[PDB]
Nucleic acid binder design. Structure first.
Lengths: 75, 217, 158, 290, 104, 121
RNA sequence: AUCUCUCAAAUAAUAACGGAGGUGUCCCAAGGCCAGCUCAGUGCGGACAGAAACCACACAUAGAGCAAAAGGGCAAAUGCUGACUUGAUCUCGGUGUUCAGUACACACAGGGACAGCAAAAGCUCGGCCUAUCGAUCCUUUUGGUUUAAAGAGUUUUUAACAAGAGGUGUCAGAAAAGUUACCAUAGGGAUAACUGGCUUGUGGCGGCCAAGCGUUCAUAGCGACGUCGCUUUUUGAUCCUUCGAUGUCGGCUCUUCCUAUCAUUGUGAAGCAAAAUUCACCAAGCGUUGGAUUGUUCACCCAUGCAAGGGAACGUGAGCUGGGU
RNA sequence: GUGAAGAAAUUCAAGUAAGCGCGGGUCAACGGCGGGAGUAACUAUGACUCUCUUAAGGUAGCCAAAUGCCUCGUCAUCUAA
RNA sequence: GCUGGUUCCUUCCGAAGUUUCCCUCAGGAUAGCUGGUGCAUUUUAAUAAAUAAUCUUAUCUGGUAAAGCGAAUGAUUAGAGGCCUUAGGGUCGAAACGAUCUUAACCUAUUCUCAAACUUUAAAUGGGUAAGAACCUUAACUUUCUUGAUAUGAAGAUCAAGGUUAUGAUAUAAAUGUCCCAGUGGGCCACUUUUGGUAAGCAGAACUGGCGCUGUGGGAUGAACCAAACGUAAU
RNA sequence: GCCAACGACCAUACCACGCUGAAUACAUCGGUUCUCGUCCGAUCACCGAAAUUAAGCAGCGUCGCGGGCGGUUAGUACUUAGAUGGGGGACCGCUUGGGAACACCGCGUGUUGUUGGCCU
């Protein structure tokens, strides 16, 4: 027989009882399914981060090897 | 087969349209909507009187057949045979479905228990709102008594409740009667079948010019 | 007795507008899209290469993976009722730029600057928004045509 | 007829109404991959006219194309090309011209000398190492049929012999017969040196004087005999590599609102006074008879 | 009718390039025992049981899909790739000829 | 169409076009057999004019009974200098009220040269 | 099992044996790609030339076409024709849908490899997008230059692993004909036949307005097309109550009640001379029969009669009967 | 049982009984036993004629049958009905 | 997989009749709802410069109500105007080819009425996201790379500067595991919306609230109506 | 005031018609030997200039079409929310708030980017 197949009464009273449950706000998120390198490049820049204080100044002195960079403003 | 309309008096559904494959439907003879001197111009019939409704009534089309043949057969008796223009302002463009018991011959043996529930088409109906005129009689101002009394005998064939406007219109125009004349008197309105023309100005020149030609020369 | 399947009831989600048919204007391919940017989804009905499904048109979310010519957006889809975080790839013409941050990012400038001009005068900041207060007490002169001006009905006779 | 036609009709774009672009190359050229976000395309426009060809390097942007550099064949009378500006060989030196008019902007003049001895071989440039990789460009011909040996590919042949890295094949260079290929490089050395224009004259030196009153007239006005055309076109190649001065101009100016000039557009007042007299003139045409 | 041109240049997995490949049809290879599944269905059946296993009735499909062994022409490697369900299919073909009046 | 049994891709008809240095000699050949006072229409409103002929041998050819006779229709399209603007790939465009050819431009030019009257029936 | 438009109430979701349809295929091009050209139709022209074709010039915002249903979509295409083609391939995961947020299946965004077209940019992982499909077990084939058969060697064989195939359409997938009035059990008022309830297509039904008929005369008496209400014993419609049982047709007998008046009492009207009759009002007080046939109820027939109403507890089986089923 | 190929298991081939298949006989064996058209000096009816099918088209006979739906068939009788 | 029963008292919390699959439709599994038991801890945890859920702001989306047919498609009434040469009767005329009107269309400007499977326009009620230190800039560093002559872009690792922390009102505590533990997977009623039916105390859906589980006050009477939710008592 | 190339948004740009257009230009335009395509040098392809501003095109004109915008139809239609509000029913009214649409009237007729260039 036929009384009540497929209703929605009590369905958002239930879904609002142990309530509606926003997901999350995660600082870091999974990189699962990203562009696969991209991520091998960032896995190569993550290793080579070596200078905190030392070489990070030094290459400006190497900029002055061409007395700076007058020319490469174009490309 | 000719189903009564005690069972079909309301706007019970969002209205059935008329498809383009269901031929086998009954052909009515509600083909007539204007009656009287339909060819006379606006200058011949300046009085206009409507039969305005008072509910969101759904009218049958049986009632609208009677409402025109009633008002014809006083106005061909008490108005002169051409001195009017009965016009139905209201067309019966809907379908009613009648699942009747045509369950004789007694041995099909499955006919319907509740299998299946297709509807069966046996006519039309015409839906009405409040303040929606059903007929309008365009005539001359002399028969004003003869027309407002003609429409009383059109009330008693319609269900519901009707109210009888005499218009400030000049016949079947959109214009007020005095406001008709002021716009008419120089060039600005033009005759037609039963209606007028509305500010022929823009554009560009010759329509202003040639309509100024013939009113001058 | 159904919907099912995948593009049903899209006679108006992916209908084109009135007379905006035709070649997609070529700025759509020229926009720059970054990772963590926020983005809307209006499934463009003239591009069949990876439309969003109909449950994501209308919905905004954050990009987090950009590719050659599509973008992987994170859209919140409510199920019953536990709101999920989906991970949708769509192309570019099924995406627009949000504006919902754009006002705020000009509010971050000015609250940096309304404190910057008040960096020198010192006092006082008054940074945060207010909703609409009551107006004040005025007084208004006629001054200009004293009263009445007096509307009084007569509304039926018709 | 055709009145509710206009309510529903909408227009193809602007430059499909003028017939200028095609928007089916325009999407597909200027498409960069949306993960190499904003590094531009730098394609190569070659557009040709009855008088004067045109080559511009450009990359599109949201707000119209940016243009890095442009070089026309009208600059060539500086470098010795007086007449015959839409040869294939006159199209060669223009694409040679921007390929040196642009590397001065980048300072890529020490590197990528290019095919200094032009003979007609596909010398795509080599990336000189430990530093600046070669400039990249892609060909945009647009609305000309890329038939085997059209004029637009010498402009390409100007660029790849200038030094710009463009991927190309040879199948639309002249004389590479597709029945069957026939890498015949030397027909360039007859075409890029313009000699078959000259050998058209050398096969018409003898028949008609009126042939010189016909086509290749005005070589006769400058005494340009049919023998030294290579010597023009050889001399241009070493002279285009002298100085692309980028066409500096210091008129500054005679430009502003001279003289009016183009029939300003009649505001509504003097529109109304035009209609006021016209309605007054028509009753005056009517009051004449009465 | 589904023609297949009986040659094609697809991916020879052994040569690791595209090689010219001759095409065929897979047909069937009957059930030759002793496969262990027959060696079992020849003992569950044996004396006094009354038919132990399902006898599949209720055939519903009208077609089957077709598998083409595609032999390499250099290294004679083969490859089974299916197609869609097709009710008529002849390879070899007499390739379609277009814009053509039926004659005589 | 099956009223005359012609079929899709049956190749019922032959046609050929002539541009320049051969039109103006073939037409005057076609005009002597036309005895060129040709009737008035014969004149499409877009300035074009064509005509039927019979008995195709009199166009300067031998009778050649191996091939027999063949009835012909001619059609001549006139123009002005400039109509390639209508028919180019790059920067195309239409023409205007004039240079579009009226029928009078096609009747005058037939009255002026070739001296034929238009037989205004 | 599945798809499209609607229902669907402006996210998405939503149901009925609701409405209109579709699918179990078709395509070596109808797949790919590069180039070229633009369609429905209308208009004016041209021997045989109408609807006849075919050539030909202008107009022509898609009114054409796109294998097929429907919907979107497409104009230098995704349409038409031509070039050349095999990306309708191989591999690894991930996402969208269905969602339990599982699997197939379809689709999508990519990495790797090999390629096709293209001058190149680029485009292609089948069909312009939304349907066109199938586990385990078993059989099978293709693949390693394979692993195992456990005392050891080689060869046959068998098996294993990987990717396909053979199919379950009741489509998340048993291998399956009837009958029982000779019957049975577990239950069911989740479910019929039966009373009661609600309902009215049917039944039955009385006012409004008059086209009329009524010789003349609208309304003495009727009253077309309309229109509005009233009753529920039938006919159904439903499935509320009862299946650990409400005796299920009638007739016989015997009560009372109702008017929707057949006759009688009291009156009004008439196309009311008398007689006879018809219309209407107050009226349920007293009546409303004997028989032939049939199990029936209405039924018709003979006869009585100045003059032979209609109905209510489907009245009434520990009242009878047992003719019907 | 027989031959052949193989190192063998095994695989192949000839041959292949009764049934079945083909064929004959049987219905006091199970059963079955037709249509449409046109026609006779009034209408009616159709002795006849065409014709389509089938294994054979229900013959002698009986019948609104305890067997006929329509049906309370139509006619006569029995009856006051 | 069905019927009947299933034995103390108080205290606390407190449902479901829905989804998907099943030779499944009086049953299961499965998620939702429930209780238990913890645990982690916050200048929204114990002597906030940070979360979270109705309004505001800002910004996206939508094609229903209304509107429309003098916009497409689809029906569609009425006449008007027209060179016409499509013209039907004719007519003055041998026909008229001279002409006359007429009538049919056709064309032009109108007009009456509409449409679950029609749209130009387009609400309210709604759906999404945002609203600051997990921020804002500044720097030069990083990368094998695919792209790039700053070996620039991007995504990052460490420094420099940052006022008063960036709508409102709320916090009966919130966050999270396990036992996916019990029961349930027959629902009925109602506003407004709505489909089938002629109607129905009928059938089927959308929303909210109830009844089921719920007494008390009111409607004489009653599962749902209107008030109001309930420890024992006084006022 | 301009022109070309390349565009962006894609009718305020479109359509019809008419007028004008210095220069830079663009074209129109001359040819077929080569490259090259065609039944046909028309289309493309390649050669280079005699002719012309007719036309394209550019600028404008029109109580133009359309399309754009604004007022206004209108606090209207509809709609959240409330009542033990009306009515026999259809349906209506009130309260609390959000609030359109055709038409109609007006007003506008593309704005601009990068690069070379003309300057009446």
């Amino acid at each position: 027989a036929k009384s009540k197949n497929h209703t929605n009464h009590n369905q958002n009273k239930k879904a609002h009882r142990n309530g509606i449950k926003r997901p999350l706000r995660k600082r870091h998120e999974s990189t699962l399914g990203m562009d696969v390198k991209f991520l091998i490049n960032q896995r190569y820049a993550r290793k080579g981060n070596l200078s905190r204080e030392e070489s990070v100044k030094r290459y400006n002195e190497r900029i002055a090897s061409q007395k700076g960079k007058p020319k490469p403003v174009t490309l | 087969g000719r189903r009564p309309a005690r069972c079909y008096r309301y706007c019970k559904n969002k209205p059935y349209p008329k498809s383009r494959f269901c031929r086998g439907v009954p052909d009515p003879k509600i083909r007539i909507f204007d009656l009287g001197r339909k060819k006379a111009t606006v200058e011949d019939f300046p009085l206009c009187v409507h039969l305005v409704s008072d509910e969101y009534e759904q009218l049958s089309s049986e009632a609208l057949e009677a409402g025109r043949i009633c008002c014809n057969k006083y106005l061909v008796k008490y108005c002169g045979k051409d001195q009017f223009h009965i016009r139905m302002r209201l067309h019966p463009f809907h379908v009613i479905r009648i699942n009747k018991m045509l369950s004789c011959a007694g041995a099909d043996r499955l006919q319907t228990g509740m299998r299946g529930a297709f509807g069966k088409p046996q006519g039309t109906v015409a839906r009405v709102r409040i303040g929606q005129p059903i007929m309008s009689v365009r005539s001359s101002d002399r028969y004003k008594a003869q027309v407002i009394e003609a429409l009383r005998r059109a009330k008693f064939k319609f269900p519901g409740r009707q109210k009888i406007y005499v218009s400030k219109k000049w016949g079947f125009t959109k214009y007020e009667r005095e406001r008709y004349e002021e716009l008419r008197d120089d060039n600005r309105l033009e005759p037609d079948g039963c209606n007028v023309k509305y500010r022929p100005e823009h554009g560009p020149i010759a329509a202003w010019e040639k309509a100024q030609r013939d009113v001058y020369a | 007795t159904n919907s099912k399947g995948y593009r049903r009831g899209t006679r108006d989600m992916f209908s084109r507008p009135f007379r905006k048919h035709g070649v997609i204007p070529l700025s759509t391919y020229m926009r720059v899209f970054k990772i963590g940017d926020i983005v809307d989804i209006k499934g463009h009905g003239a591009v069949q290469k990876g439309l969003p499904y109909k449950a994501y048109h209308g919905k905004t979310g954050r990009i987090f993976n950009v590719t050659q010519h599509a973008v992987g957006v994170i859209v919140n889809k409510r199920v019953r009722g536990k709101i999920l975080a989906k991970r949708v790839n769509v192309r570019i013409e099924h995406i627009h730029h949000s504006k919902c941050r754009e006002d705020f990012l000009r509010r971050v400038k000015e609250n940096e600057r309304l404190l910057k001009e008040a960096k020198e005068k010192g006092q006082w900041v008054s940074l945060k928004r207010q909703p609409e207060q009551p107006k004040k007490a005025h007084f208004v002169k006629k001054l200009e045509e004293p009263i009445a001006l007096a509307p009084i009905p007569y509304e039926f006779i018709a | 007829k055709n009145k509710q036609y206009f309510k529903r009709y909408q227009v193809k774009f602007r430059r499909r109404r003028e017939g200028k672009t095609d928007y089916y190359a325009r999407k597909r050229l200027t498409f960069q991959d949306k993960n190499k976000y904003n590094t531009p395309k730098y394609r190569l426009i070659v557009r040709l006219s009855n008088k004067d060809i045109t080559v511009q390097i450009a990359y599109a942007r949201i707000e119209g194309d940016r243009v890095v550099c442009a070089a026309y064949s009208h600059e060539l009378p500086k470098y010795g090309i007086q007449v015959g500006l839409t040869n294939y060989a006159a199209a060669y030196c223009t694409g040679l011209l921007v390929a040196r008019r642009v590397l001065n902007k980048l300072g890529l003049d020490s590197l990528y000398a290019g095919c200094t001895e032009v003979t007609g071989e596909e010398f795509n440039v080599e990336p000189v190492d430990d530093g600046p990789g070669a400039f990249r460009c892609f060909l945009d011909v647009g609305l000309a049929r890329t038939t085997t040996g059209a004029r637009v590919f010498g402009a390409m042949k100007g660029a790849v012999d200038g030094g710009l890295n463009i991927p190309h094949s040879v199948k639309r260079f002249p004389g590479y017969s597709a029945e069957t290929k026939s890498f015949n490089a030397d027909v360039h050395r007859a075409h890029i040196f313009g000699q078959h224009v000259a050998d058209y004259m050398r096969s018409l030196e003898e028949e008609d004087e009126e042939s010189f009153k016909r086509q290749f007239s005005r070589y006769i006005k400058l005494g340009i005999r049919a023998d030294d055309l290579e010597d023009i076109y050889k001399k241009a190649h070493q002279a285009i590599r002298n100085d692309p001065t980028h066409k500096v101009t210091a008129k500054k100016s005679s430009a502003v609102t001279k003289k009016r000039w183009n029939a300003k557009k009649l505001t509504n007042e003097q529109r109304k006074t035009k209609i006021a007299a016209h309605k007054a003139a028509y009753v005056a045409k009517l009051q004449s008879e009465t | 009718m589904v023609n297949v041109p009986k040659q094609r240049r697809t991916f020879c997995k052994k040569c690791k390039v595209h090689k010219l490949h001759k095409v065929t049809q897979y047909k069937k290879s009957k059930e030759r025992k002793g496969a262990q599944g027959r060696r079992r269905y020849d003992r569950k059946q044996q004396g006094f049981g009354g038919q132990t296993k399902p006898i599949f009735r209720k055939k519903a499909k009208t077609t089957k899909k077709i598998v083409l062994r595609m032999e390499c022409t250099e290294c004679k490697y083969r490859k089974q790739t299916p197609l869609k369900r097709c009710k008529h299919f002849e390879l070899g073909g007499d390739k379609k000829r277009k814009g053509q009046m039926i004659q005589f | 169409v099956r009223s005359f049994g012609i079929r899709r891709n049956e190749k019922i008809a032959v046609h050929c076009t002539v541009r320049g240095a051969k039109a103006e000699e073939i037409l005057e050949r076609g005009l002597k057999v036309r005895e060129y006072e040709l009737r008035r229409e014969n004149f499409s409103s877009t300035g074009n004019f064509g005509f039927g002929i019979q008995e195709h041998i009199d166009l300067g050819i031998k009778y050649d009974p191996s091939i027999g006779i063949y009835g012909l229709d001619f059609y001549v399209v006139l123009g002005r200098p400039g109509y390639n603007v209508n028919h180019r790939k790059r920067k195309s465009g239409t023409v205007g009220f004039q240079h579009r050819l009226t029928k009078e431009d096609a009747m005058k030019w037939f009255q002026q040269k070739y001296d034929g009257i238009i037989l205004n029936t």
